[PDB]
Amino acid sequence: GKIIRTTKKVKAHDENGEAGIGDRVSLMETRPLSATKRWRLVEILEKA
Amino acid sequence: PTIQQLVRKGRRDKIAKVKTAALKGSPQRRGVCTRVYTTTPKKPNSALRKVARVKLTSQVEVTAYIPGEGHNLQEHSMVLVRGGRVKDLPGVRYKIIRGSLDTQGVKNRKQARSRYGAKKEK
């Protein structure tokens, strides 16, 4: 019953490579595009 | 143990020391006895018990204690063996059921008759 913090890594698709290291973004699900990726990028809200 | 320790590791439950592993969890096996002889008990008890060496279908060699006061078992005999522990004999974990296959119930039994396999008097 104790709260546990866990994280998973999921790889998405971007068309311009506009995302740098240490930024937070929104994601949406899509059709499969290759192995082990099933997502696209929504938009970049902040840049660090 | 603290919360992060429990989260990181988890607690492993105890493992059960299985008894009569030659049965593989199966209550009864049929076996053929190879030799029949006698053994001596430990210090507290002094007697001369009867035990048999039986080849199991599981290809496991194990001792088998013979209950009752009389028996007709000889070498190369069909035996039905159940599981049962004896204290005095060190390495005996099995008891031979009476009244099945080649062994017949010991005579003159009238009390506790079903255990030793005696038919009803008329």
Binding site: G1, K2, I3 | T2, I3, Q4
Partner: protein, 131 residues
Amino acid sequence: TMTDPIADFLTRLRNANSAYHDEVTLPHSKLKANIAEILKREGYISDYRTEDARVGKSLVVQLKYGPSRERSIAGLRRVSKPGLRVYAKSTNLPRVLGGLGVAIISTSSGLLTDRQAARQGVGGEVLAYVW
């Protein structure tokens, strides 16, 4: 280090009760203040009032004793702590001392007592059991 003001407050209060003391001075905080407020409202404590110290505000709590000197507080324990944080739904509100104690639950309104919280149907995390 100093890592849990609420547990420290509860332990200092019950240690003072065990030692038969009368006044305790602690660093002031909103959580300590309103917990003392609900303690005053239920009547397990005598009275509280804030003060000013060399640096910042401090709160003093006066324990309650009767003519026959028996303790007005039986025991305290905290259930929700950093790490193991326990929470209650709207239907599983904890029962303390067979309903004769008090559980402090922070609801949308605030730190409020379990009986009226169940009356409202609201719920949340239980701070401590006081009985």
